Amino acid sequence: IRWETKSCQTASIATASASAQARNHVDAQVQTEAPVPVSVQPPSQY
Amino acid sequence: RKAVIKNADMSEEMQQDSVECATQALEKYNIEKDIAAHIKKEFDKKYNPTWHCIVGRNFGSYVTHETKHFIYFYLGQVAILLFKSG
């Protein structure tokens, strides 16, 4: 005959943002040098 | 699925049965509708009707229960409300 009223509640939760990324690239530039440290005719005496 | 009882108006024997019954339901069934159904049916059989069971991760309720037939507890992160009314 005794009806008791009760109130229930569950705990809340917490989320968080995040990200993923594959490997990254970057540019590059090269110029080949053309040095010619060469004389005309060295008179050798080997 | 560790059990922690938060509030009860229930005999110790029924409290233990609630935890063990809900634990079995949670091991066997993945979906709350089925977990709740398992738990409710076992109580109607053993402790007579009319039992009600709510199982979930996020809810509030306001209900009326019969004295000495109320328990609210967690299994891990899942809350189970088990009581008689009607």
Mapping DSSP to helix (H, G, I), strand (E, B) and coil, where does residue B39 land? helix
Whole-angstrom CA distances from B54 to A13, A25, A44, B3, B22 are 19, 53, 103, 16, 11
Compare CB distances from A8 to B64, B67, B72 and report the shortest one's residue: B72
Domains within chain B, CATH numbers bracketed? 1-86 (3.30.740.10)
- Could you tell me the two tokens for A8? 């229930």
**Chain B residues near residue A13 by CB distance under 8 angstroms:** 57-58
Is B57 touching A (CB cutoff 8 A)?
yes
Whole-angstrom CA distances from B60 to A46, B33, B37, B56, B79 are 102, 17, 19, 10, 10
- HSE of B32, CA atoms in CB hemisphere, 13 A: 13
Is B86 touching A (CB cutoff 8 A)?
no
CA distance B14 to B3: 15
What's the angle, vertex CA B49, arms to CA B51 and CA B81, rounded to 5?
A: 10
- Could you tell me the two tokens for B59? 């809810």
Nearest to B53 by CA among B62, B64, B41: B41
CA distance A19 to A44: 69
Pairing between β-strand B78-84 and β-strand B69-75 as defined by DSSP bridges: antiparallel
Give the resolution to one decimal, in Å. 3.9
